[model samples]
Target: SYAQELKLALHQYPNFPSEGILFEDFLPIFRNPGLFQKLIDAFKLHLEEAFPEVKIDYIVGLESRGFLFGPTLALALGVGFVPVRKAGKLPGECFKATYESDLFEIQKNAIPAGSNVIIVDDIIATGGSAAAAGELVEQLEANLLEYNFVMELDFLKGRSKLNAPVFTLL
Candidate 1:
């Protein structure tokens, strides 16, 4: 009961954005504000319960989908929000991280040295993007507390590539 209802909000579509890729259209979850609230609330509850004594310095959100709820969640937690922009999107001097072609860039000055961060992504398919974010965190000299995702494709086993702890819901 804890996750069944929220899980239903996702609708799957075959060959979306590319051939042979079944996309779990997550935007549906955000179409209804109440559903969106549940999404964020679940994560907030997780962070509160998971790291009760740790101070979070920033929310490191991946490009595209991760952008959706990361800032709002950061605000709710009273912490700074930093975007891990897609390559060629962010201006000026920025640090770079990647997994094959899934490139992520972040402003060099956005994260102060030794800041604590949680990399949040809407989904984790191959764990490549989360790995990229962690690399960016490493470049900034920030402490990666964990990697959080709304959903994970278990067959992909993306979590294996990450060095820090990981939490995936639904």
Candidate 2:
């Protein structure tokens, strides 16, 4: 029933991005406020059931797309939110977080050292970006409790690169 309920807001787009590929459109899931809240609730429920003992200090979200509902989700869970903006080798006392060809910088002061964080992104494909964030966490000597996402390409074996636990909704 839960699967069917969440599935209600999903749609299939034929030949999206290119031909011969079925794209799962995730836009409709948040059109209805109730559906959007339901999605958030499920994610929180999973964290509760999966890591009841872990104390999450903040939710680190990627820029733009991840910005969409990540702040809301963090607020819903009563946790602080940190963000990683996509930039071209930023200037300042920033740490280099490389995700294959992709890279970003952490302010080094946005969050204090030894804080626990949960990295949230839209997907974990290649796990490169997420893994980079984990690297940043390690550099700061902060605790990376886990990585969460709405979907992950299991075939990509991205999770293999991550040394922390992972939770995927789809």
Candidate 3:
């Protein structure tokens, strides 16, 4: 299955960027075009099957990691891609939210009010950032269709922090 192949392509690092944290590096998947296609295919398939009746207006992605495949996925799905960036990163009027100790911002009119959107990120751990992204979405009055992640740290119970349904491919 595409999900299983994506999972197999992941490389794990112990205590990366900090101690007591095992990081699942998905950058390797991008190195192989086939695996990368599978990643998008898997998510696209799920979105089509899960929301056959819905019209997704945009794909909102969090900063840095989310920017990776988020745009590609949006392209594959034939929707616009909007980004939530770190403080001072995005210009023009923006909606701001604090995630943990850091700040995130999204363009004020990135998605019009009542537009259906899905937030996508590489991973969901603790869900702080995802929730912050959700806040920005709400400020714009857009409908949050769902949150999508490539992988999730289930033990972190991150899903509990999000206000909408979450779909994790692996």
Maximum-TM-score candidate = 3
The full ranking of all candidates by TM-score, starting with the best, is 3, 1, 2
Estimate, for each residue in 46-140, the C-alpha lDDT of model 1 and write its tens digit: 99999999999999898888899999889989999999988999998999887887778999999999999999998888888789889999999
Evaluate residue 41 in candidate 2 and report its C-alpha lDDT on the 0 to 100 scale. Answer: 89
lDDT of 3 by residue, 77-116 (tens): 9999999999899989999999889899999977899999
Model 1 residue 26 CA deviation (Å) reads: 1.2
TM-score of each: 0.94, 0.85, 0.98
Cα shift from native, residue 107, model 3 (Å) = 0.3
Judging by lDDT, tell me the better candidate of 2 and 3.
Answer: 3
Question: On residues 28-49, what C-alpha lDDT tens digit does candidate 2 reach at each position?
Answer: 7778788788878877887788
Best by lDDT: 3
Off by over 4 Å in 1: 17-19
Sorted by lDDT (best first), the order is 3, 1, 2
